[PDB]
C-alpha cells in the first residue's frame, strides 16, 4: 500500500461516486433528514483511507477531507432534524431546491425564477407599464535612403545649403515631416554633417562617409559619429512654423521628392 497507482485512482473514483451519492443524500436530508447516510459515508471514506494508509498522494488527502467536511455537516443536520418531528428554513431551501431542476452553493436560475413567478402570480399589486410619448417632447529604411540620396544629390560633397532650404518641402507639411524623418534616420548612418555658414545659418554638407569594408567597422564608425559633439538644435515644426521657415530661408522646391 505505498504507491500503487491503481489503488489511488480507484480511491479517487469511489470517492467521486461517493460525492455524487452524498449529493443525493443532501437532497434526501433536506426533504427528510437521515443520519444513516452520514454515518455510512463516514465509514466508507474511513475504510478507503485505511486502504490509502501507506499511500501518500496529497490529492487523496484533500478530497478525503472534503468528504470529512461534507459528512460532518450531514450528521449535524440529521441530528437537528432528529431532535424533533425551521420548517420554513427547510421549506425555503426546498423552495429553492425544488426550483433547482438543473441537469438533475451559488444562486440558481430557476430559484429566483420560481420565487418571482410566485409573487407575481399572487401579488395583490396590479402590474404596471410605461411608455415614452410626452417624455418624448516603403518601410522606414527605404524612404530614409531615398530622401538622403536626394539630399546628397542636391547638396554636394562640400557644398553647403541652409538647413530649412533642405528640410522644408513647401508643397506639403506632411511630406516635409516625412522628409525630416528620413533625413534624421539616415543621419544615424553618418554620411552628412552640419556646419555654420558665414551668416550663421546652419548649412548641411556631405560628411564624406569613410568606406569601411567590414559592416562592423562601419557600425563602429556610425557609433563614433553619433558620439561626436551633437549640437542638438530642436525646433518645433508645425504648419505655421513650417511656413515661417519657408519664408525665412527662401524655400521654393521640394528638396526630397
Amino acid at each position: 500500500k505505498d504507491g500503487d497507482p491503481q489503488l489511488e485512482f480507484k480511491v479517487l473514483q469511489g470517492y467521486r461516486d461517493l460525492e455524487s451519492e452524498m449529493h443525493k443524500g443532501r437532497a434526501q436530508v433536506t426533504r427528510t433528514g437521515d443520519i444513516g447516510v452520514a454515518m455510512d459515508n463516514l465509514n466508507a471514506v474511513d475504510s478507503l483511507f485505511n486502504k490509502v494508509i501507506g499511500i501518500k498522494n496529497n490529492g487523496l488527502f484533500a478530497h478525503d477531507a472534503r468528504a470529512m467536511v461534507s459528512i460532518s455537516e450531514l450528521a449535524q443536520i440529521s441530528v437537528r432534524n432528529l431532535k424533533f418531528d425551521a420548517d420554513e428554513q427547510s421549506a425555503a431551501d426546498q423552495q429553492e431546491e425544488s426550483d433547482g431542476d438543473i441537469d438533475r452553493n451559488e444562486f440558481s436560475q430557476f430559484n429566483w425564477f420560481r420565487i418571482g413567478a410566485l409573487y407575481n402570480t399572487i401579488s395583490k399589486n396590479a402590474p404596471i407599464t410605461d411608455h415614452l410619448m410626452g417624455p418624448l417632447s516603403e518601410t522606414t529604411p527605404e524612404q530614409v535612403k531615398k530622401c538622403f540620396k536626394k539630399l546628397s544629390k542636391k547638396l554636394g560633397p562640400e557644398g553647403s545649403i541652409n538647413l530649412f532650404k533642405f528640410i522644408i518641402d513647401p508643397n506639403s507639411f506632411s511630406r516635409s515631416i516625412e522628409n525630416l524623418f528620413y533625413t534624421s534616420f539616415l543621419i544615424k548612418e553618418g554620411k552628412l554633417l552640419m556646419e555654420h555658414d558665414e551668416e550663421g545659418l546652419p548649412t548641411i554638407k556631405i560628411k564624406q562617409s569613410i568606406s569601411h569594408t567590414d559592416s562592423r567597422s562601419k557600425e563602429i564608425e556610425r557609433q563614433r559619429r553619433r558620439a561626436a559633439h551633437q549640437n542638438h538644435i530642436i525646433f518645433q515644426m508645425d504648419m505655421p512654423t513650417w511656413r515661417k521657415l519657408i519664408k525665412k530661408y527662401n524655400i521654393t522646391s521640394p528638396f526630397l521628392d
Binding site: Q223, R224, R226, A227, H229, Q230, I234, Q236
Partner: protein, 116 residues
C-alpha cells in the same frame, strides 16, 4: 517661474559611455522623441535618471555609476539645467526665487557614486 515648473534647459554630457561631449538644447513645449537605440537612448535615460538622484535600477540596464563613464575615461560630466520651480525651497542653492539651476554631476571611476 515664467515657464512650467521644472523646465529643463540644454543638457551637456561629457565622457559618457561613448559621448566624449554633447549638448541637447531641449524643448519646454513638447518632446515626441522617436527613434530606436544604437547610441544608448536607454543609456541616455539612465544618465538622466542617475544625474538627478535617481537609482539606475528603475530600468536596470547598467547599475554602477562609475561604469557609465566613457571607456578610457575615469571622469564624466553631466550638466542638467532646470528652470527652478518655486516649489523647490529650503535646499542648498535652492529657493523659490531661483531661476535656473545647473546640476553638474561629476562621475569618477574611483567613486561608486558620483559627486553632484
Amino acid at each position: 517661474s515664467s515657464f512650467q515648473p521644472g523646465s529643463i534647459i540644454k543638457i551637456r554630457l561629457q565622457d559618457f559611455v561613448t559621448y566624449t561631449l554633447t549638448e541637447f538644447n531641449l524643448s519646454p513645449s513638447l518632446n515626441m522623441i522617436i527613434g530606436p537605440n544604437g547610441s544608448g537612448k536607454s543609456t541616455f535615460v539612465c544618465a538622466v535618471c542617475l544625474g538627478l538622484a535617481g537609482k539606475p535600477e528603475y530600468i536596470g540596464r547598467s547599475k554602477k555609476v562609475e561604469d557609465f563613464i566613457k571607456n578610457g575615461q575615469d571622469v564624466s560630466k553631466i550638466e542638467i539645467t532646470l528652470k527652478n520651480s518655486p516649489n523647490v525651497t529650503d535646499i542648498e542653492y535652492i529657493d523659490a526665487r531661483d531661476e535656473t539651476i545647473k546640476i553638474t554631476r561629476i562621475i569618477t571611476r574611483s567613486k561608486r557614486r558620483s559627486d553632484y
